[PDB]
Ligand binder design. Structure first.
Ligand SMILES: O=P(O)(O)OC[C@H]1O[C@H](OP(=O)(O)OP(=O)(O)O)[C@H](O)[C@@H]1O
Ligand SMILES: O=P(O)(O)OC[C@H]1O[C@H](OP(=O)(O)OP(=O)(O)O)[C@H](O)[C@@H]1O
Ligand SMILES: N[C@@H](Cc1c[nH]c[nH+]1)C(=O)O
Ligand SMILES: N[C@@H](Cc1c[nH]c[nH+]1)C(=O)O
Ligand SMILES: N[C@@H](Cc1c[nH]c[nH+]1)C(=O)O
Ligand SMILES: N[C@@H](Cc1c[nH]c[nH+]1)C(=O)O
Lengths: 208, 378, 378, 203, 379, 378
């Protein structure tokens, strides 16, 4: 295969990206949600799509298995985006990375225990606040961690704050703003710019 | 017997291939008027790292000379050694050098990179003209083409002069330069747009990252202060000249990136990166340097060619054990002359020690039939 | 600037010569059925120094792998790497290996010796027969003869088995062995005769020093217990077979020294040392060792051959600058085809950048006279 | 809360564990698809399988059920593996594209099970480059991210349906009962009745 | 900025406490006849790791001596340095040593464990008698008791000799030993009972795991082959002697675990582990290490682990009033400095201020001039 | 059991002495209002070497954090750690800190120097006044005097501000600075006079080396440009104030050297070096340094005090073995109470394991005569 491989996260990212793609001349030929397929052809026979877990998109793109992808700044910050180009803020799937603790419970006086997916983001943030923390890596749902005293706080993605409040947690500190970004393999940007430029302009046009 | 990450044996046919490539390519460069030099693996750090960036210093293993107590280094790069050699032998005129040697890196450069590349390269000293930069491209593509590879070389052109002039004209701090070089290296366009709105000539630094690829129109997008700078206008003109030469002479797809500062920071002008297929780490790295003498050159890891080059299947011959031991002295002498003839023609002939002595990947037997020795495919 | 003691640039024609020697000799070994292996300059000490003498451990520079925190070494000897490779790939049958690579020593071996030899060698694994030791001599002398050297290689044969069997049979103490090895090494015949008159089988240890050179008659001079010992009779028979083979097949002057214990202390049987003219440090070192797996091989410093080998004077050609620039495109293409033909024949042709561009050691100009391009001696 | 907190993985592990629990006097009071049980001493956490060792080793859970696959990858130094439950049986295997041959370079492995991968290829005297994947691995060989994958295999149907085939058998996988070191010392009186009922249920 | 995992500043009152503990405990050991030695942080690996387990070698950071080119290590353990020192200075008789020093580990031992413990310990060389093992317990408990801690030390007694003799007598393979040590370490009683039913003397290996705690009756539960082994009978007798001594002399709750093989693998007999409250990582590790022969037994503790369980009296932090002091004549100033010198001698922390704003951290008292007189005044 | 050069055991009574000195001196500093801090032996290089001279970077051993892959260092100096701590905890007001800890140097500092000093020191942060520099001298001499040493401390005062102002005003190159610092360090007056005749304000740089000692008249010897510089006049006035304070308050022989720049290059003003007797390496090093925060402090190697301090002979007591074992339980309990009383008073009492159990340097026996335990000098 000689054209562009686009890495997409399933769920929120996928649904909000289809309009940008359609405008760039790239329609998927069926609905992924009801398919046992992970490589999808499109109406542009140069472009094909991979449906991945959001955390694997930077991996596939940096190694060139995908030429470009859409992933949240949250996944990019955690993973480290040194080996890819973040060309475009797409301003889709907007949320924030925040610390969160039990509702009305105060910070204890001991060494803070943080439970999170976003281990590197956590270390970075608490470093910048001059705070030394013990970090516990969680792959799954983090809202449980403070309630059984695994961690004092969690670092997680927050939109309305409804998921926190419904589990007896509340947002404390704002770490940074999160939006899905267009990332490109460094080599793919140099070698396949002719194939990319039309789609990057159509994405640039769709946003502004 | 596990090996350190980024350290691999090159074994058997791969080792034969590597040896052929090293030799073909070295002889090509020698016939193009480049003087072969073979500098040592170790020097004192005073000479080996004389005018070196932190990146080259960090890639160089340090060891102790027990004769003097002084620090030495295992070379991570030969180019600085060519500089030392040229300083003594080169004189004021034009001088050409080529080299092939092992170098050691403390850390791998890219995803699953080697720490033990076989560095092969050429340097031209004593010519200011872009003509010297064009000769090296011609020599390199002459070499690449001779390998009859299926894989294709994408060339990336950069120019460090452009950013360095903008840094001087905008009078950037030591730390502001670091933050821009970090952002450029991941082409973080959003976070760069924010940083650039508060920096002096900040729009020019953003222009490099967003519109650096379009070298035809880059000058017309820069600030009037920048556009007036002769060293910036020359730099952008040098990129256009090389881009044109590569497309016209060599039918080479060139991409420009004027924010490429990831090569060794002894580079003072034009920079070249040759990528093979879709591989992250470039095969070839080259550019201008000046450690009061003009210099330009390139280096490549010969070991990275292995997976993309093929040799003719070798002829691996085993002399029949029983037949040979049945021979009189005069008959044995007669065979050895015939075996010597086969080896001269490049046949791999094993004189067996036992009936079971079997060469790896046997293709032919040398067998005795009716008082005569002939080859027989197995 | 200045280089460390025992570290030298190999420059220009010496570098060309070294490159040709490395390649000719590697191809010879490959055609004799030896598998080329190219193991790395650095391994973990666990593998690199696995079963090594304190002398080999002390000759190995140490460095820290920044990925694991573990100790690595710059190899001082490749043979241990061939052992590792053989252990994984070789199997139980006979296996042959050749190698050429840089090795680094912490200290020089002899007065003003190199610390950066280009070690080139062959190993046979998996054969007990003296036949394997005879094949290596054949391969080595095939290589030496191909160099067309003026200097002559003197071979010194030893056998450590002889002294080691006498030490076991005479049940020598740990310290008595040390005193005899010291006296042998300084050929102190008087003080040896004194020590030997009080040692059991002491006359046999004196016989080694006085009459070891005369291998034809050595067995008939030893005590009855020694003369019957199978491992001593085999040892003295192996020396006679090699001595004969070297003189008859290869016209080599052989001297025997059964009191030689000089070389890497991993040697377990026959030992050979090739000396070039009257040079104190041997060019070639070889003998038996153990991978249990049988092993024998040799190594040489390719760089020690440089001073004793000559190549044909090279043809260094400069194309006239003014004439070339006066050519139309079709005329330029016509010259480049002619230049390509010359380079294929091994001519060193410089396409000049300026009117002053002068190759080092210029022999010929390619000049245009009556619409024709011809070579002209300067 | 003074009693036992039980960490359970959702999916295959959960469905196969309910019978063992029921026999130990512990029924969940609703379908998960923090939970009280019929035994008011025991409560249950429904976690991602990979987080069970984490919750147990830190004492946020007193004991849990996780596959030997997750325990081997995570490292089970800080917990006690008391029982092989012989439920949710499968195997850790290497897998590649159907009939595709080994390349000449160092093998590139794409897997969740990064440490298991390194361990296995170490034990076979092979050096590998490993790429960490959190999601579905069957795609990795097909777009040449890795040469092989290391993944859990039951029938082999998921591999064959994606054009992959199992190569090497790394080890056998079953769900295990792990216990917090402190919980085993301090709450053995509450644990022992449930451990015996689990010991009994495997016959 | 941020620090590496398992590396922490000890600051302010914690630093003062650590300094007092280090000193009190070192003086105690010196008064019990232990010779203080202060060996360096770095040695050549030849001496530092001479007869070390792969676990001790892996915990030791390596560096290159730029004078010789030879390998050195940052010590992860002082005991091997005491061994080197004893070899040169100790002679053939009994010799006692104590030490307090920083050691560095490459990896942390426990969840969020320290990599920079302040290792403090004692060693007795040249005595075979269990009496030397009893003296060390006496010295240790003398030290623990002097700290007036609220927390209580649980002692776990083990003996590596017991399992090692059973392994030799039952002629276990290299791998079978590994499978039993893994099952012991995870207290997998079911899967152990299965493995043990097919092993020679298998019932003895199951007995260790099920009934090892009951050391009074352990001998009467072992096979006749095992019961006849003098090294096993001695081992079980040493545990009973120490268990008794600890309960009678020191009112210590002792638990026995003859399956504990977890310390540094240079241990050759009796092993003791002191746990503080319900903490997973032991405070104190000790046992026999006859093997460089010279007889040797000792213990080490991380002084830093005591911090959370020890208290000092709140300190007196005194600030001299700036304005009042500067209003004094020379004779009046000299008179104050004598009073200040008296306070410091008594352990008062007195700041002679440089400015009106010069404020010591956690100020408790002001030294103030009221009716031509200098007195302390709580704030 | 040989140790590396510059690495020594402190054993037995020397170890006891070192422990007492460390503790006495730490408690003195704590009672003078200095906060004890105990920072770790290892940090990431990012924090440990944040704004460090090449000399401090070169003295710091590097090691690999296997959790992150990042570089760490074994601290060669604590002062930078106090700076990090002060930055977080200190606030804007005045803050005092003291510390005692082991530090490791890669190389020894002078003739037979230690690489493992026990660094003990004090820092005052947040005060510009020379008063803070005067408090530290007072605290230091309070400490030195408390040791009741026979040896006497010679103080050497320098000021880096003087040379740094001359370097700025004369607009010196990077290399010219290096040549002057080298010449100053060996007080090479002849070769300095030559170099200085070609440098701008060169006579001022020569004046520093020739007439720096005579601080009373130094200002009146400098160029008019130099004499009008406020930072130079302040610097020379600070030296006079400290010189006077040290002679008047402390009866201390002071020598001035305004070309002393041999301390750690983070120094920004006054520098102090305390020499004990005629020893080449100073015991105490101190000076001003900067974060936008004022800082001054000193450090000393506690180990260097050992040879110049004495403690009261210790009381080393051995309980009679035979007598103790003859006691009933109640009688044993009674002795242990008496032994506990002796230890509380600082007696070193050995409860013997055997009749031969002999403490080193035994002074007294605790012996039983007529149902009573009494001390007896041996
Ligand atoms: O701030 P709120 O409005 O409550 O929403 C934020 C939540 O949305 C996402 O859930 P989801 O499980 O849908 O994300 P994923 O499945 O894509 O990981 C994410 O995990 C947040 O917890
Ligand atoms: O029957 P087979 O074709 O061999 O496949 C069995 C599958 O079970 C595992 O995932 P599962 O969906 O059971 O659990 P998970 O979703 O929690 O990983 C695994 O990923 C296998 O693909
Ligand atoms: N030695 C450089 C390439 C180069 C040669 N000359 C100039 N640049 C490298 O390996 O990156
Ligand atoms: N490697 C040895 C020679 C040798 C190879 N095989 C056996 N001996 C040397 O350098 O001296
Ligand atoms: N040094 C050991 C304890 C010990 C001292 N002596 C014998 N054992 C440890 O750190 O665990
Ligand atoms: N740390 C410095 C002395 C110092 C402390 N504060 C200022 N200077 C040294 O050892 O050389």
């Amino acid at each position: 295969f000689l054209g562009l491989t686009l890495a997409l996260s399933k769920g929120r990212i996928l649904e909000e990206t289809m309009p940008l793609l359609r405008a760039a001349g790239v329609e998927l030929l069926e609905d992924p949600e009801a398919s046992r397929k992970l490589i999808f052809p499109t109406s542009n026979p140069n472009v094909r799509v991979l449906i991945l877990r959001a955390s694997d998109v930077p991996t596939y793109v940096e190694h060139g298995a995908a030429d470009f992808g859409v992933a949240g700044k949250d996944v990019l910050l955690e993973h480290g985006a040194n080996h890819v180009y973040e060309l475009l803020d797409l301003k889709i799937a907007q949320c924030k990375l925040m610390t969160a603790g039990v509702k009305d419970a105060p910070l204890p006086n001991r060494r803070l225990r943080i439970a999170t997916k976003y281990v590197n983001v956590a270390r970075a943030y608490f470093a910048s606040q001059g705070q030394q923390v013990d970090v516990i890596k969680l792959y799954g749902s983090m809202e449980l961690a403070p309630l059984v005293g695994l961690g004092d706080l969690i670092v997680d993605v927050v939109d309305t704050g409804n998921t926190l409040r419904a589990n007896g947690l509340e947002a404390r500190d704002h770490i940074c703003d999160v939006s899905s970004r267009l990332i490109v393999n460094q080599v793919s940007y140099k070698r396949k710019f002719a194939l990319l430029e039309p789609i990057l302009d159509s994405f640039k046009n769709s946003i502004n | 017997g596990m090996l350190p990450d980024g350290v691999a044996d090159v074994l058997f046919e791969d080792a034969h291939k590597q040896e052929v490539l090293r030799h073909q390519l070295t002889q090509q460069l020698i016939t193009h008027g480049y003087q072969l030099v073979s500098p040592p693996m170790i020097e004192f750090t005073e000479s080996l790292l004389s005018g070196a960036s932190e990146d080259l210093k960090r890639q160089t293993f340090k060891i102790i000379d027990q004769l003097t107590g002084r620090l030495m280094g295992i070379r991570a790069d030969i180019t600085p050694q060519i500089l030392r050699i040229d300083a003594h032998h080169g004189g004021d005129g034009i001088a050409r050098y080529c080299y092939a040697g092992d170098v050691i890196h403390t850390l791998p450069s890219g995803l699953f990179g080697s720490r033990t590349p076989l560095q092969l390269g050429a340097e031209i000293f004593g010519c200011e003209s872009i003509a010297a930069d064009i000769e090296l491209i011609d020599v390199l593509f002459s070499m690449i083409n001779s390998l009859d590879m299926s894989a294709v070389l994408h060339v990336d052109l950069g120019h460090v002069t452009i950013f360095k002039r903008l840094a001087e004209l905008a009078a950037l701090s030591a730390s502001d330069t670091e933050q821009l070089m970090q952002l450029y290296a991941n082409k973080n366009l959003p976070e760069l747009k924010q940083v650039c709105q508060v920096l002096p000539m900040g729009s020019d630094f953003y222009t490099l990252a967003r519109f650096g690829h379009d070298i035809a129109n880059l000058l017309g997008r820069l600030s009037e202060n920048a556009q007036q700078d002769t060293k910036i206008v020359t730099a952008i003109d040098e990129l256009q000249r090389l881009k044109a030469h590569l497309q016209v002479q060599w039918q080479c797809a060139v991409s420009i990136d004027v924010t490429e500062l990831s090569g060794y920071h002894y580079h003072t002008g034009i920079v070249f990166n040759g990528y093979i297929n879709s591989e992250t780490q470039p095969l070839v790295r080259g550019g201008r340097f000046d450690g009061p003498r003009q210099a330009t050159g390139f280096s490549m890891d010969v070991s990275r060619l292995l997976a993309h080059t093929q040799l003719d299947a070798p002829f691996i011959v085993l002399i029949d054990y029983d037949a040979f031991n049945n021979l009189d002295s005069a008959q044995r002498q007669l065979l050895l002359q015939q075996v010597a003839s086969l080896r001269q023609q490049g046949y791999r002939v094993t004189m067996p020690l036992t009936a079971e002595d079997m060469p790896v990947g046997l293709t032919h037997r040398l067998s005795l039939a009716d008082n005569q020795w002939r080859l027989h495919a197995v």
